[PDB]
Amino acid sequence: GDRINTVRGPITISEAGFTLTHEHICGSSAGFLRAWPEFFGSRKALAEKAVRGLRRARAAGVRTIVDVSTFDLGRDVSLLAEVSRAADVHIVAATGLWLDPPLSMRLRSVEELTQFFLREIQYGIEDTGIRAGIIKVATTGKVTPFQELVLRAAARASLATGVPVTTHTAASQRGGEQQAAILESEGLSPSRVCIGHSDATDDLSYLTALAARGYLIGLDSIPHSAIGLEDIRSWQTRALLIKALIDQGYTKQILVSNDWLFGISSYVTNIMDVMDSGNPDGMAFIPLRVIPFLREKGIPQETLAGITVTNPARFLSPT
């Protein structure tokens, strides 16, 4: 496919440019932003903060982000569109389900879920006409029966439309292997799938084996190590996983991001200020800090451009 769905409409592959493949404008819950905007100060304040942040990321070279907020992460695509336009940064929206499905999702069959994901990709999200360009799934180490249904529905929607699938995994339980087995049982190519939060451990055997099968490896939370006052595991250590996979021959399988946001209600109160204090760069942390760090370790310009431009383009191109 020669075009990608964004919250402002379709764009050509070449227009995506430097792309952060796992980000959020807001981390919330379905209906929450509209029912309780003053949780974030106001909707206007949240939008203004997001625009300031996206504009700074753009100044640092970012051209596109993929907002991997699903329905149950409180995705408000109208907000995504507002901020995309004002920051002049492309935003790709997601369908799928994260870890907080309400009853009206949890009690659905695989066939029903498949039709929901297809609606969001092929028709539009809500009444907005904005179409999703990626399918987000989350599991909790040992995949539950419902999460298995979500994975199967995601695979079927991907096979029907060509849009990729991206996952949430938990640290330590090597969640990508369980996810990969289920997705392949549906006939989905690994080249359509990113195993996310893969920078949460240093298990290189796990990462390389997935990469060797053709999975994209989401090293997508690099600055999360900077949130704490003095995290035992540094952001540099997370960033060195990028170099490790390059050195093993898997440059083409790497996707990098911040997994940042501008507001969060899906966590206890006041975490946003801790996050912003630890990583004032926000979404600009990848281009301003991680890229120069890797350059200094001797990774060539061509390799960094391949990771930040070519790999996301190949991933997002409907195939």
Residues in the annotated binding site for Zn(2+): 22, 24, 136, 168, 197, 259
Of 23 and 82, nearer to ligand CAC (C-beta) is: 23
Q: For a copy of itself, which is the closer residue by CB, 249 or 267?
A: 267
- Read off the tokens for 44: 């206007």
For residue 14, the minimal CB distance to ligand CAC (Å) is: 28
- Cβ atoms of residues 241 and 202 within 8 Å: yes
Minimum distance between the CB of residue 93 and a copy of itself, rounded to whole angstroms? 12
Instruction: State the binding partner of 35 from ligand CAC, Zn ion, a copy of itself, none, CB within 5 to 8 A by kind.
Output: a copy of itself
Rounded to an integer, what distance in angstroms lies between the CA atom of residue 23 and that of residue 21?
A: 7
- Asked if 259 interacts with ligand CAC (CB under 6 A), we say yes
d(CA 120, CA 70): 10
Q: How far is the CB of 53 from Zn ion (least distance, A)?
A: 15
Nearer to a copy of itself, 11 or 81 (CB): 81
Q: Does 168 bind Zn ion (CB under 5 A)?
A: yes
177 close to 149: Cβ distance less than 8 angstroms: no
Query: Does the footprint of ligand CAC cover residue 168 (CB under 6 A)?
Result: yes
b/e per residue 208-247 (b: at least 16 CB within 10 A): bebbebebbbbbbbbbbbbbeeeeeeebeebbbbbbbbbe
Question: Which residues ranging from 83 to 142 are in contact with Zn ion (CB under 5 A)?
Answer: none
- Asked if 82 interacts with Zn ion (CB under 5 A), we say no
**Are 24 and 259 a contacting pair, CB within 8 Å?**
yes
27 CB burial (10 A radius; 0-12, 13-18, 19+)? buried
In one-letter notation, the amino acid at residue 232 is I
Query: Residue 74 touches which of ligand CAC, a copy of itself, Zn ion, none (CB < 5 to 8 A by kind)?
Result: a copy of itself
Q: How far apart are CA 238 and CA 215, in angstroms?
A: 19
**What is the closest distance, in whole angstroms, from the C-beta atom of residue 249 to ligand CAC in the complex?**
28
192 lies in the binding site for Zn ion (CB under 5 A) = no
- Rounded to the nearest whole angstrom, what is the least distance from the CB of residue 224 to ligand CAC in the complex? 8
State how far Cα 65 lies from the chain centre. Answer: 8
Smallest distance, Å, CB 281 to ligand CAC?
Answer: 17
Contact residues for a copy of itself, defined by CB under 8 A: 28-32, 34-36, 38-39, 71-72, 74, 99-100, 102-105, 107-109, 112, 116, 119-120, 125-127, 265-269
The residues binding Zn ion (CB under 5 A) are 168, 259
By CB under 6 A, name the binding residues for ligand CAC: 27, 73, 168, 259
